Design a protein around this ligand. Sequence first.
Ligand SMILES: [La+3]
Ligand SMILES: [La+3]
Ligand SMILES: [La+3]
Ligand SMILES: [La+3]
Ligand SMILES: [La+3]
Ligand SMILES: [La+3]
Ligand code: NA
Ligand code: NA
Lengths: 110, 110
Amino acid sequence: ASGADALKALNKDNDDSLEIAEVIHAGATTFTAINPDGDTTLESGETKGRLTEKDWARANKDGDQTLEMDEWLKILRTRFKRADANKDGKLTAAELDSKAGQGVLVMIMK
Amino acid sequence: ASGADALKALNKDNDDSLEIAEVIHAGATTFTAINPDGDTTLESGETKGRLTEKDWARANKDGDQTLEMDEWLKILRTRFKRADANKDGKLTAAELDSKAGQGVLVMIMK
Ligand SMILES: [La+3]
Ligand SMILES: [La+3]
Ligand SMILES: [La+3]
Ligand SMILES: [La+3]
Ligand SMILES: [La+3]
Ligand SMILES: [La+3]
Ligand code: NA
Ligand code: NA
């Protein structure tokens, strides 16, 4: 999806950017949206096309084979900061359209 | 609540302990449940009896006045490790009955 697409679906506060509260919340809903087996965790087979193998290495450090909500969202907040080019806490459509911004979108839109 | 109370209410996998996947899930459910004003965040007035001001200082470092899902769960995972006395990844009723374990329960039981 484009940055304009993401703003159409997720932005509700009469601006033209996504902030950390909007991004984390959408990331939490997407966590549930991509979990179809009825448990409470994400496995490597459920994150294909959204997380890489190295993403699991930097987030999953408790020794298990499961991604909990906080581990999932920690990757998201890091991608948020990587896409925040001018570091103002807001992600415009142009910032969401960057290669780093696209990494945010795959975690907040199913 | 006591450790035995928490296991009866929250433990579903036929053991005698709460693991990190079960704790994070109940903490995520509690986050939404104790948020009555219709937004997606927790404010300081909504975490009374569960978090202290120093908890906000160590978790809320993005400069706002709101606690997002990942900031809330980050406090919880730290409390989990503080309560995991033998560091085996499981919280028994006895560990949930300690001072550190009660800090876990106030974040996973509304
Ligand atoms: La906004
Ligand atoms: La799953
Ligand atoms: La994990
Ligand atoms: La258990
Ligand atoms: La609130
Ligand atoms: La915050
Ligand atoms: Na920005
Ligand atoms: Na333990």
